[PDB]
RNA sequence: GGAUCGAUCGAUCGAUCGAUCGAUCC
């Protein structure tokens, strides 16, 4: 590849010894700019010394891509390129990998962990430091942790040969800025976070960049919601019936939350039902036998209410048949699991109106107008250009399958081939798609491939390799200015559209203010690129000193841990699970329970996605061992040579033995008890 | 099992927490 003029212009300030925050839209070719910077940096050293340039890549796909690119480009002059990730540093010494190599493409988390425990005492071992998607420097990003270590070494007084920051990004972003002054302040703060005084943008060779980074045009498609909703009536009646049934066992159900006006099929109702569910978990009775039944019935009632609300939310954006299939799948999973009297009554009450629900869903006179407008614009764009590819975005993982089923089950648009792509999802749930599946989906999506449209989540916003599309569609998709720019930089074809379909003026207003914030960011960058380097260095030094003082001031010491024995009970059945005395912490993050009395309290099931994070190994998954509970208590791992269950506090109620009060914790950091470290003995 | 980011919503007094969803990493 020949270095273009604007690429050399962007790489010119970096080949001088000063840190740079070079930014360019998607498709400019910043990887080649970083390659040129790396090539120029590794030759400025005379005979006797060499460089240790490092390259940070957050995501594993882009990490492997950059590693392969650097290998194909640099294994010809005599440089040793390597790469560390989660499946590489299981037992290999990272220090020997860094010392015996010149170019490293490790992930920021591995570097953070090494700097933390025992490896790489200082960042002076490297000479160059490139950050892929450097805009991710934020409150607590690993990039920001590495930069915090860098700044603590710099402003500590004992600084040595510090490396050079060549962090590359596509959109600097403004954050929560409202005017140009706040945008400039945020840009200066981000510049001081990376310890750089130069922002390299394309100014002279702007005509060459526009010949390959052609930006699309945006079209707002605000439509009207459905007026005749016969599906919401039956689901609302079922929700009212379930709420009235739940009010029988809990008279003060309306006082458990401070939400006054709740509406079915919204997010406020979801918050209300979650608050109610959390309030009935700490419900205590001096019987230890009636409290469990009431708590279980309330848990089931709130779960059914949450499922009804989710079905209404799905039907608001998709067809009535999709929410009905979701409800049928939920009730079939309920039937396959434990079947008590409450669940039997709920299932029979649902089946009482399931026939009317099916009759309403089969009626084609109440089709979602949003889907009608989507079909219209899709068929229009595919009649104008048959060789078009769509990257239609959807904010919900449960809605991409609905959109795929709607596209497949529609005779009006048969030229489409769904190529849906969601992502890895939860690491302890059987949801999402794996990395090989994602690679196969992305490889089969080309101009001549077997997929001309993919319904993707926010996974296609950050660094990823997708074909050049021209039919970007945002179906109720809204974010920030950074995500807006990332989405717009996806349709960089020769003439593209960025349609935004929604049924709410709030999304249109948010897109307008995002465009305004992008203009503000551009103006702030243009203003900042005219200041002197000395005053900018002084300003970023002052900002770094202030941030370091703030970070060193908020060093909250560990409070006095409650050295009192308390019991952890199941969150669904309120059954005695274990005690806080037999709780051991492996590596200050994972909490296990030892003892033969606890092994008979849970049951093991095969894990869907086994993997090793640091030194464990997911062998199974633990659930409650009651009559019919099936409550997720944690997971089963193998630390060194023995199988141990590690649990999470987000599924256990903490009851004090002496006082008797119950409290709920979401993370183990909020649980301040006498945590004993794990001993390989016993 | 843990950590982090983004979006939306709720409580309290522009700020602090809480909830939902998506994504990333170990
Ligand atoms: N000088 C060049 N000549 C030919 N192709 C190039 C050149 N520079 C970049 N490209 C192509 O453009 C694509 C841009 O990818 P990359 O460099 O990662 O930037 P981005 O992250 O914006 O996509 C690369 O896949 C590369 O093949
Ligand atoms: Mg890049
Ligand atoms: Zn239980």
Please give the helix or strand (H or E) that residue A324 lies within, else none: helix A320-336
Chain B nucleotides with an atom closer than 7 Å to a protein C-beta: 1-12, 14-15, 18-26
Neighbours of A586 (CB within 10 A): 18
Please give the helix or strand (H or E) that residue A602 lies within, else none: strand A602-606
User: Which residue's C-alpha comes closest to atom 23 of ligand 1?
Assistant: A27
CA of A106 to the centre of ligand 3 (A): 43
CA of A450 to the centre of ligand 2 (A): 28
Task: Give domain limits for chain A.
Answer: 1-214+532-560, 215-227+368-531, 228-367, 561-682
Residue nearest to nucleotide B2 (CA to C1'): A589
Beta-strand pair A128-131/A54-56: parallel
DSSP alpha helices (H): ranges in A394-532?
397-408, 435-443, 481-488, 505-528
Residue A644 C-beta-side C-alpha neighbours within 13 Å: 24
Question: Torsion angle, CA of A463/A466/A470/A474, rounded to 10 degrees?
Answer: -60
Beta-strand pair A566-570/A497-502: unpaired
Which of these, A675, A614, A672, lies nearest to A639 by C-alpha position?
Answer: A614
Instruction: Report whether A626 contacts A573 (CB < 8 A).
Output: yes
Which of these, A474, A476, A471, A473, lies nearest to A507 by C-alpha position?
Answer: A476
Please give the helix or strand (H or E) that residue A498 lies within, else none: strand A497-502
Distance CA A136, CA A252 (A): 46
Please give the helix or strand (H or E) that residue A390 lies within, else none: none
Distance, CA of A328 to chain centre: 29
Instruction: Report whether A321 contacts A361 (CB < 8 A).
Output: yes
User: Which residue's C-alpha comes closest to atom 5 of ligand 1?
Assistant: A1
Handedness of CA A446, A464, A456, A507 (dihedral sign): negative
Q: Looking at the DSSP assignment, which residues form a beta bridge with residue A474?
A: A393, A500
**A20 annotated as belonging to a binding site for a ligand:** no
Distance CA A569, CA A315 (A): 37
Handedness of CA A167, A169, A171, A175 (dihedral sign): negative
Which experimental method was this entry solved with? cryo-EM
**A280 annotated as belonging to a binding site for a ligand:** no
Distance A431 CA to B13 C1' (A): 40
Distance CA A321, CA A310 (A): 14
Nucleotide nearest A614 (Cα, C1'): B26
Distance CA A19, CA A128 (A): 9
**A31 annotated as belonging to a binding site for a ligand:** yes
Distance CA A640, CA A590 (A): 14
**A634 annotated as belonging to a binding site for a ligand:** no
Distance CA A614, CA A89 (A): 8
Resolution in A: 3.0
Residue nearest to nucleotide B1 (CA to C1'): A590
Which residues hold their Cβ within 5 A of ligand 3, which is an ion? A 570, 572-573, 575, 624, 626, 629, 631
Distance CA A304, CA A284 (A): 22
Round the CA-based radius of gyration of chain A to a whole number and report it. Answer: 28
- Contacts of A267 by beta carbon, 8 Å cutoff, 6+ apart: none
Angle at A149 between CA A145 and CA A152, to 5 degrees: 135
Distance CA A644, CA A84 (A): 28
Residue nearest to nucleotide B8 (CA to C1'): A267
Distance CA A76, CA A530 (A): 40
Ligand 1 pocket test target in A29, A57, A130, A167 with most atoms within 8 Å of CB: A29
Distance, CA of A2 to chain centre: 37
Angle at A347 between CA A342 and CA A352, to 5 degrees: 125
Q: A60 — phi, psi (to 5°)?
A: -70, -45
Q: Looking at the DSSP assignment, which residues form a beta bridge with residue A501?
A: A221, A475
Can you give the three-state secondary structure of A351-370, one letter per residue?
HHHHHHHHHHHHCHHHCCHH
User: Which residue's C-alpha comes closest to atom 15 of ligand 1?
Assistant: A29
Q: In chain A, after which residues does the backbone break, taking C–N over 2.5 angstroms as a break?
A: none
Handedness of CA A501, A502, A505, A506 (dihedral sign): negative
Which of these, A341, A343, A320, lies nearest to A331 by C-alpha position?
Answer: A343
A28 lines ligand 1 (CB under 6 A): yes
A57 lines ligand 1 (CB under 6 A): no
Handedness of CA A425, A431, A436, A441 (dihedral sign): negative
Distance CA A183, CA A175 (A): 8
Number of residues assigned to chain A: 682
Residue nearest to nucleotide B26 (CA to C1'): A613
């Amino acid at each position: 590849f020949k270095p273009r003029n604007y690429q050399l212009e962007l790489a010119l300030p970096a080949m001088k010894g000063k840190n740079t925050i070079i930014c360019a839209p998607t498709g400019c070719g910043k990887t080649f700019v970083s390659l040129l910077i790396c090539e120029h940096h590794l030759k400025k050293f005379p005979q006797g010394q060499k460089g240790k340039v490092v390259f940070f890549a957050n995501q594993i796909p882009v990490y492997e891509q950059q590693k392969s690119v650097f290998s194909k480009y640099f294994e010809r002059h005599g440089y040793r390129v390597t790469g560390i990730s989660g499946a590489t540093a299981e037992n290999v010494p990272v220090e020997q990998i860094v010392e015996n190599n010149d170019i490293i493409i490790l992930t920021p988390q591995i570097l953070v962990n090494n700097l933390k425990k025992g490896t790489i005492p200082s960042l002076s071992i490297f000479t160059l430091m490139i950050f892929d998607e450097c805009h991710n420097t934020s409150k607590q990003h690993p990039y920001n942790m590495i930069m915090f270590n860098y700044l603590d070494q710099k402003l500590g007084g004992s600084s040595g040969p510090l490396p050079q920051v060549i962090g590359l990004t596509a959109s600097v972003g403004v954050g929560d800025a409202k005017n140009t002054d706040e945008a400039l302040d945020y840009i200066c703060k981000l510049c001081a976070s990376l310890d750089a005084s130069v922002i390299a943008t394309v100014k002279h060779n702007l005509e060459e960049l526009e010949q390959v980074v052609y930006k699309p045009q945006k079209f707002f498609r605000k439509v009207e919601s459905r007026i005749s909703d016969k599906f919401k009536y039956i689901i609302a009646q079922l929700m009212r019936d379930t709420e009235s049934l739940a009010k029988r066992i809990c008279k003060d159900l309306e006082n458990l939350s401070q939400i006054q006006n709740r509406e079915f099929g919204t997010q406020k109702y979801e918050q209300w039902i979650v608050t109610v569910q959390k309030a009935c978990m700490v419900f205590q009775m001096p019987d230890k036998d009636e409290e469990s039944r009431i708590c279980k019935a309330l848990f089931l009632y709130t779960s059914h209410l949450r499922k009804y609300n989710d079905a209404l939310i799905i039907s608001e954006h998709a067809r009535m048949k999709d929410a009905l299939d979701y409800l049928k799948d939920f009730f079939s999973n309920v039937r396959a699991a434990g079947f008590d009297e409450i669940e039997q009554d709920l299932t029979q009450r649902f089946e009482e109106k399931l026939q009317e629900l099916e009759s309403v869903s089969r009626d084609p006179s109440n089709e979602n107008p949003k889907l009608e407008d989507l079909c219209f614009i899709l068929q229009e764009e595919y009649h104008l250009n048959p060789e078009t590819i769509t990257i239609l975005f959807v904010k919900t993982r449960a809605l991409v399958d609905a959109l795929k089923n709607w596209i497949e089950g529609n005779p009006k648009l048969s030229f489409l081939k769904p190529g849906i792509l969601t992502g890895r999802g939860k690491t302890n749930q059987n949801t999402g798609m794996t990395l090989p599946a994602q690679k196969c989906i992305l490889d089969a999506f080309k101009a001549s491939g077997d997929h001309n449209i993919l319904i993707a989540t926010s996974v296609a916003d950050e660094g990823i390799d997708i074909a050049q599309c021209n039919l970007v569609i945002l179906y109720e998709y809204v974010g920030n200015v950074i995500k807006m720019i990332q989405t717009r930089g996806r349709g960089r074809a020769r003439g593209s559209k960025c349609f935004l379909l929604t049924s709410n003026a709030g999304v249109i207003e948010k897109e307008q203010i995002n465009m305004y914030k992008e203009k503000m960011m551009n103006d702030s960058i243009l203003r900042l690129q005219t200041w002197d380097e000395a005053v900018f260095r002084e300003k970023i030094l002052h900002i770094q000193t202030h941030e370091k003082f703030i970070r060193d001031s908020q060093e909250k010491p560990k409070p006095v841990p409650d050295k009192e024995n308390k019991k952890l009970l199941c969150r669904k059945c309120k059954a005695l699970a274990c005690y806080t005395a037999d709780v051991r912490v492996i590596e200050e993050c994972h909490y296990t329970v030892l003892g033969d009395a606890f092994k008979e309290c849970f049951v093991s099931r095969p894990h869907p996605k086994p993997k090793q994070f640091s030194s464990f190994e997911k062998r199974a998954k633990i659930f409650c061992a009651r009559q019919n509970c099936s409550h997720d208590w944690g997971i089963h791992v193998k630390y060194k040579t023995f199988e141990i269950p590690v649990i999470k506090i987000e599924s256990f109620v903490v009851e004090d033995i002496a006082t008797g009060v119950q409290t709920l914790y979401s993370k183990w950091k909020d649980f301040h008890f006498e945590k004993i470290p794990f001993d390989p003995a016993e």
